[PDB]
Amino acid sequence: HTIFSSLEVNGVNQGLGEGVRVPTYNGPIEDVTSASIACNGSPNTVASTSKVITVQAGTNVTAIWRYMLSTTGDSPADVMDSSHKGPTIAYLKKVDNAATASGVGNGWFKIQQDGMDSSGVWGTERVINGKGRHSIKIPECIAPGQYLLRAEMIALHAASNYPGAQFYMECAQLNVVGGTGAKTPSTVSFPGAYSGSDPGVKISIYWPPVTSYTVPGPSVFTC
Ligand SMILES: *[C@@H]1O[C@H](CO)[C@@H](O[C@@H]2O[C@H](CO)[C@@H](O[C@H]3O[C@H](CO[C@H]4O[C@H](CO)[C@@H](O)[C@H](O[C@H]5O[C@H](CO)[C@@H](O)[C@H](O)[C@@H]5O)[C@@H]4O)[C@@H](O)[C@H](O[C@H]4O[C@H](CO)[C@@H](O)[C@H](O)[C@@H]4O[C@H]4O[C@H](CO)[C@@H](O)[C@H](O)[C@@H]4O)[C@@H]3O)[C@H](O)[C@H]2NC(C)=O)[C@H](O)[C@H]1NC(C)=O
Ligand SMILES: [Cu+2]
Incomplete structure (x- = not known):
């Protein structure tokens, strides 16, 4: 239980729920083929936001994960329960209007x-x-x-069967400036890229001990 509730760009936090479509409820999505897998959604309620954040291509943004929208600290208890072991992932999607x-x-x-x-x-x-x-x-x-940035944390503590894995994601709204356009990545669909039978979705992270873990989705795009 956690929320990607704000984005930091160039050392400046862009504001709680400002440029990030945040739910108030920090509960997970558990149906990987639900339309909600893309940017969260029902049965959660996701707030809209008119802010589109400028980011220079090649630089970093930092998704700031918090337990709830009211959370003030940055300690483990302020982020997510330590039982929620799993991968962190981030995606981009080119869109006509990120808002x-x-x-x-x-x-x-x-x-x-x-x-x-x-x-x-x-x-x-x-x-x-x-x-x-x-x-x-x-x-x-x-x-x-204009891009949507989908940042995701998957908790696998209860993922021995499907459904069981817990998907926490939110989408930020970016205006990427300075991008050279020299490369166009191959793309996948959300829902669609994850399956309930993926080795990284249905998995017992306790027995037997995990030797190697396969993050779901395509391979990372790199320039
Ligand atoms: C902008 O964004 C980018 C990302 O988009 C940032 O780049 C990442 O930066 C992070 C943080 O600096 C960096 O973290 C890891 O760095 C080491 C990764 O090693 C890689 O190469 C290995 C080849 O030998 C490979 O095995 C690794 O892959 C394994 O692990 C990953 C998960 O990490 C799996 O997904 C994968 O399947 C495979 O199993 C990597 O590919 C890694 O050594 C680091 O871990 C150490 O420090 C952690 C934090 O303390 C700790 O949790 C971890 O246990 C480990 O600690 C041990 O060593 C420490 C010293 O190294 C020491 O504290 C102790 O002795 C511990 O025993 C870390 O996880 C990513 O690799 C970067 N990613 C890329 C793609 O570059 C970038 O920083 C950011 N900002 C900018 C650019 O300004
Ligand atoms: Cu939880």
């Missing part, structure tokens, strides 16, 4: 992921113990313009 585009459907490409490392430490744990900061490199080589 109004739905996000459902084709066009998503992955730009970051953090699964499980050789020490058995998970991406969500690095965010939980890292002040809720989820750093994401905006590629320098993509086309400039």
Whole structure:
């Protein structure tokens, strides 16, 4: 239970729910093929926002994860329960108007992921113990313009069966400036890119011990 509730760009937090479509309820999406998998949604209520955040291509944004919209701190208890082990992931989708585009459907490409490392430490744990900061490199080589940024944390503590995995995601609204447009990524659909049978969705993270973890979705796009 957690919310990607604000975005930091160039050392400046852009405001709670400002440029990020945030729900008030921090409950997960559990149907990977629901239309809500893209930018969250029913049975949650997601607020709209008119702010579109400028970001220079090639630089980083940081998704700021918090337990609730009222959370003030940045300690583990302020981010997500430590039982919620799993990957962190981020996607971009080119859209005509980032303030109004739905996000459902084709066009998503992955730009970051953090699964499980050789020490058995998970991406969500690095965010939980890292002040809720989820750093994401905006590629320098993509086309400039309006994008949706989908930042995601998947909790796998109850994922031995499907449904069970818990998907927490929100979409930020970006205006990518300076993008060279020299590369166009191959894209996938949300819903569609994840399946309830994916090795990274239906998984017992306790027995037997996880030796390697396969983050769901396509491979990361890199310039
Ligand atoms: C802009 O955004 C980008 C991302 O979009 C940022 O780049 C990332 O930055 C982070 C943070 O600096 C960095 O974190 C990891 O760095 C090491 C990753 O190692 C890679 O190469 C390995 C090849 O040997 C490979 O095995 C790894 O892949 C494994 O793990 C990942 C998950 O991490 C799995 O998804 C994957 O399948 C595979 O299993 C990586 O590909 C990694 O060593 C780091 O972990 C150490 O520090 C963590 C924090 O303390 C800790 O949780 C972890 O256990 C480990 O600690 C141990 O070593 C520490 C010193 O290294 C020390 O504290 C102790 O001895 C511990 O025992 C870390 O997880 C990403 O790799 C970057 N990603 C990319 C693509 O570059 C960028 O920073 C950001 N800002 C800018 C650019 O300004
Ligand atoms: Cu939870």
